[PDB]
Every structure is written in structure tokens, then in C-alpha cells.
Amino acid sequence: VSQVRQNYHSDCEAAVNRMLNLELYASYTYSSMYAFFDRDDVALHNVAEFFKEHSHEEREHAEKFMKYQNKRGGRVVLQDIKKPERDEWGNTLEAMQAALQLEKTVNQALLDLHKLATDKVDPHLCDFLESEYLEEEVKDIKRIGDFITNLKRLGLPENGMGEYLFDKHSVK
């Protein structure tokens, strides 16, 4: 084993690799949403840019796991980044709903990794998750839920005027 490795369970190392992959997967999904809202027949640029920014953030989430792995003396092992579930995302409401579910998936994985770290008595990994991931997730989930509520209030999916208004006044 690595000269630096101390108190780092094989199962945690593997789970960190799987989490890295899921962050990459989330990033790629958000990229797809960006491209959809930039289509000439969709054309919601502030929405598009929201998703582009999220994609970038998710990729940074992934990079932080790679650095973490090396710091602990684990070994980064990459897998394919699966394409997103959909090719097209309907409208702002459908997309935000999909983002909520994605975030909930990511959050569940983070919470599961925290339970594993707890079980293996790895306080450093617990602290990393709590200090760099769990609160950011809660905030993001809240933001997306708030957006969904407002999209529904605006009459989505049917009310195009409402969709326009959201792009112009929310997504800031």
C-alpha cells in the first residue's frame, strides 16, 4: 500500500471512485440541459446558462474527489461517463424536475458514502463530505425546489408567457 495511506478502507476508496463517476455523470446531464435550452426552437438563454454553470460546478465536484483520493493514498480508477437519460428535456419545468431528481440521487450517494465512512471509523472522510458536499447539496436542492414551485405558479407547462417571465426574472 501507499506510504501515505492511513485509516483508509478499501471499500471507502472504491466508493470514492464511484462517487467521482456520478459527479461526472451529473455534470454531463447538466451540459445536455444547457444545449437543449440553447436550441433555436427552445431559446431560453438564462435557463441554459444556469445549467451550464451547474455543469461546471459538478465537474469541479468530481475533481475534488480525484484530489481527495490521492491525498489519502487511494488510487483513482475511472469508468465510462454514461450519456444522459434523455436527449431533449421538454421545457423549463420538466428540466428542473429532472435536476431535482438528479440532485437527490447525488445527495443520496453522498449520504451513503458518509454512512460507509462512519461504519469504517473514517472521520476525515466524514468531515470532507460534511464540509465540501452535504451543505452545498441541501442549498442546491432547495434552490431547485423553489424554482419548481415558481414554474408551477407560472402555469408551466402550458403557459409560455410564464416560462418566458421565469427566464427573465428568476435564474439570476
Give, as ranges, the residues between 134 and 153 that touch a second copy (CB under 8 A). 134-135, 138-139, 141-142, 145-150, 152-153
70 binding Mg ion? (CB under 5 A) = no
From the list a second copy, Cl ion, Co ion, none, pick the one residue 148 interacts with, judged by a Cβ distance below 5 to 8 Å according to partner type.
a second copy
Which residue is listed with cell 462512519? Answer: 118
Angle at 87 between CA 60 and CA 40, to 5 degrees: 95
Give the distance, in angstroms, between the CA of residue 171 and the centroid of all CA atoms in the same chain. 17
Residue 48: which residues within 8 A CB-CB, separation 6 or more?
33, 34, 35, 36, 37, 38
- Nearest-angstrom CA–CA distance, 97 and 150: 12
Before 157, cis peptide (omega within 30)? yes
C-alpha cell at 82: 454514461
For Co ion (CB under 5 A), the number of binding residues is 9
Give, as ranges, the residues between 130 and 149 that touch Co ion (CB under 5 A). 130, 140
17 binding a second copy? (CB under 8 A) = no
Binding mask 94-123 for a second copy (x = CB under 8 A): ------x---x--xx--x--xx--x--x-x
**Residue from the set 15, 67, 116, 171 that interacts with a second copy by CB under 8 A:** 67
162 binding a second copy? (CB under 8 A) = yes
10 binding Mg ion? (CB under 5 A) = yes
Residues interacting with Mg ion, by CB under 5 A? Answer: 3, 10, 135
